[PDB]
Symmetry: C3
Subunit: 276 residues, 3 copies
Amino acid sequence: MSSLLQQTSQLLVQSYQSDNIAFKSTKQFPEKKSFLELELIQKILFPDFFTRRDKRTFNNVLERLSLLVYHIQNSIEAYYNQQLAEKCITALLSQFVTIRELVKQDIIAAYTGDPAASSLAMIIRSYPGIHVMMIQRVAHILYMNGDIEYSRELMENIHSVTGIDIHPGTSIGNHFFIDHGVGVVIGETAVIGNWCRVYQSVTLGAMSFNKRHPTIGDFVVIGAGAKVLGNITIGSNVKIGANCWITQNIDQDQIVFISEHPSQITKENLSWVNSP
Amino acid sequence: MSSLLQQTSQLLVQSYQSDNIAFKSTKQFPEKKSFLELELIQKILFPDFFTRRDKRTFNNVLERLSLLVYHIQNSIEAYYNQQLAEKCITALLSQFVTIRELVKQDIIAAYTGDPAASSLAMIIRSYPGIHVMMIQRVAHILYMNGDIEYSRELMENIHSVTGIDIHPGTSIGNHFFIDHGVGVVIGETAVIGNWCRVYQSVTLGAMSFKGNKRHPTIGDFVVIGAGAKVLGNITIGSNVKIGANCWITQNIDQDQIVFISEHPSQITKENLSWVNSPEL
Amino acid sequence: MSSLLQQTSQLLVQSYQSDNIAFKSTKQFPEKKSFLELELIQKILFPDFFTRRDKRTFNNVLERLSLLVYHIQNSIEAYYNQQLAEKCITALLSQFVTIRELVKQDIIAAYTGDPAASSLAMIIRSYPGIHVMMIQRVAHILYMNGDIEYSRELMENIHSVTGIDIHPGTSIGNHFFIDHGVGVVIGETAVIGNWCRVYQSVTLGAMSFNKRHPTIGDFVVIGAGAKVLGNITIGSNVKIGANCWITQNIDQDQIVFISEHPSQITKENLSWVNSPE
């Protein structure tokens, strides 16, 4: 409905104005190409960082939001019907400013959680853990309103570009930060709390061989390469060391780490190019 | 060669028609872009999910097939010569329907092996483990007929898009399912049986530190859980399940469940303020 | 500026002439697309493998180099200003043939370090560990001279394409080989010596929960899945086995590996297709 696109675009413009200045910029950053939904959602959520200086008006918001919605409608129709597409888009449109506020808190969590994060522009423009969450919070609305096929395709699109695999059904709290992220897998029935931090190669997955994925409390940190598997619960304030294999419930305020250290035992160019 | 292209085109048309109903669809999906060989192979193997409804005639199949093989022929020539390129292409065309039947079984394996896979359409359009096998089964025929350079480049292309790293020399049986797949690495001389399932971050690789076998051979019905590292010229029997994060460096007999010996150990023990910092 | 671009172009052309037999090629390969900076750096460093035969004159080199330089300059200007952008561009130009020498040594390291590496052509066109180092050696110059935002952006672009995550601040010696590479993460303050070899899913990272990343010596090999965390040192000639969790220093001339083997215990298409349809 044209009326919903227009109402949502004005709500978005209001959201831009009440932004903290940290989320603003007078600069004109270079073009970022990726794929359609991400390019558009980036522009819609944070135009200052992804658009030409002259294309940051209400009409540009309306055009971009309309391109996004029409593409989403055509895809949901291809897998399902017009009736379901409309229901999904309506829900998405009503949720868009809420999504935008959630993505801002993800960005805040990245700046807080990463010593290498120097500014919000760096995080917004280049942190893949942020871009996966821009797409996931949109895809999750679609999934929850009955579209499980396009929402999965959407997540597989961002999966391809970041190496981060999050199912559209995953339920994720606020201030969620994935650092680096390549190899991260989070399954359909997983539940994640607030202020969680997750590193590369972490799996929140099903047992190797209904609810079949982990639930994670608040303020949980999961170190690189940990594999957290099965319908289990990690309590709040848990820290999980790198490469742990975790298949059991873990109580709150715990620290989990591989038990023991490994074993240690002791002990030009022309030549190399002469051999080929 | 045109006569071979026409027969393969006609055999593919016949293959489409004998498909089970589950592989067919009357719908018009949005176009999917990636890179040339993947887009073309997708349209060649499953037109119903990747092409405009008015581009599904024998001639459209022949156009897509011709463009694919002739891009392959031009790349192989660049590394080698026209004779080897023709040889590789001929083998690929003659195996093309065989490849299609194998990919269909990979799709079946994905559907049975994944509680989140709800339809064949979803699997066909979006599962990276299926897309990597579309490429790998093509590349492997090229490699086996002598083109080791372009078949590797081809595999690195699909690597760049899926994060799944499979060598063109890898020998892989039917009904093979990779779930999630990022970080998967499978080496040149590895051999994989039938009905295997492999998860993210799995290596079937060489020992960290000719006709050699330096990568693993795994049997049928093997499941390898996330993060497992299976290294060296070792054999994993059929019906073996390997738990997550395992480090395997020895042969494993059939009918074994393998897992890390010990659980990890375990010991006990806003925006406003945050926004004040980057503002100032 | 125009004259430094011309002298850098002539030094590059001479560097092409100086190459060993093995880095040359009479054949013409199909173009490779990715993203702008990688396409240009590939063509500038190895024209024989990435450009048409008729686009290898001095002016062709000068146009490719200028396109790159002007793209980087505007990108840095966008995050900072003309003053810093020129400082970085000047530094990069003065070091361009040095970077080319280092990348050739990375290629040599890949050939000697990988049995699947059959030829330099294959390595130059297709090895993602080489492509990430083409970018990183450029991005490191930019980072060292004050541009920490665009050099990060650059590294994230090559990250999307390879799944290899190397910070622009990382300091890396010569003959560096990443095999496979997906899931490799190397942090901002890490230091890597010469002739090191790193596999997929390796982290040289900070503690999960100034310098906070590891220093690695010469001839270190780190197997797949190893996590090396914190401001620790791995001495030279160390071999680190797959999936190791390293949180303490390792002296030189050591082999490190998980000490215990895993425990073990014993124990129709048509029908499936009817199920869902």
